[PDB]
Fold this sequence. Notes:
The protein is 26% helix and 23% strand. The protein is an alpha/beta fold. It has one domain (1-261): Metallo-dependent phosphatases (Purple Acid Phosphatase, chain A, domain 2, 4-Layer Sandwich), CATH 3.60.21.10. α3 (95-104) crosses α5. Residues 19, 21, 65, 94, 96 line the site of manganese (II) ion. The site of manganese (II) ion has 5 residues, from loops. This is Metallophosphoesterase.
Amino acid sequence: SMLWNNKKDEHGPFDIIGDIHGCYDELKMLLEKLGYLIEEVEGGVGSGKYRVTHPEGRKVLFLGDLVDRGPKITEVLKLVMGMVKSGIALCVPGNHDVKLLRKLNGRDVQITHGLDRTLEQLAKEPQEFIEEVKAFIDGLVSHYVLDDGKLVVAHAGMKEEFQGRGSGKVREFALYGETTGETDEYGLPVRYDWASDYRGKALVVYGHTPQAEVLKVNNTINIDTGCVFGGKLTAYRYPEREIVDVKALKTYYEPALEHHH
Ligand SMILES: [Mn+2]
């Protein structure tokens, strides 16, 4: 009964933040707008470079996809790692984060979707920081069930049946979701729209495929508003159920191509 995903004793309030993808400036703006105070620490290095506090004792929940695409990936990492360490944040992993971990561990993965930017930015940092990043990503839990089971956070979402489960299949769902088993017009796999079929008790806040505006469906909401693509970085305030966002300062990266159909 003792899984890592159980944080039911954590009641918040929480500010839940979608995919950052290296957008440090917007992250800093959003945290400040939420009332967090960010101190650039004197002499501070790596995960000790920053210290974040909140006078109302609010906590941040990051939905992952911290790395790739954007201009300030190592600063995002330093900030988020420090927050998790000081206890003001938790983080669940995105697909990009885990793929980065596999690459740093020695797997010869495809350099795509912004990973080149992470690698070239990481290259400018010392080695002990690189090991800190590996340790950080390796310890990320697939999802968290929080606040007496009233809230679930996961990167790609978490359908009811899998909530609170620690199996390998549940971790894959958190990272990637699942496919429907059938193919599309190109004979390719199709993503399963789990949120449409969701009837679970917990509100699920997640950040899967990027959207122009938050996508609320049944007791679920996707808050990846595509900051790095020139959209915005969104926080969802819990239990207030309020949306707070910061517009991207620039278009840092081009979004996926779109089929005509
Ligand atoms: Mn993403």
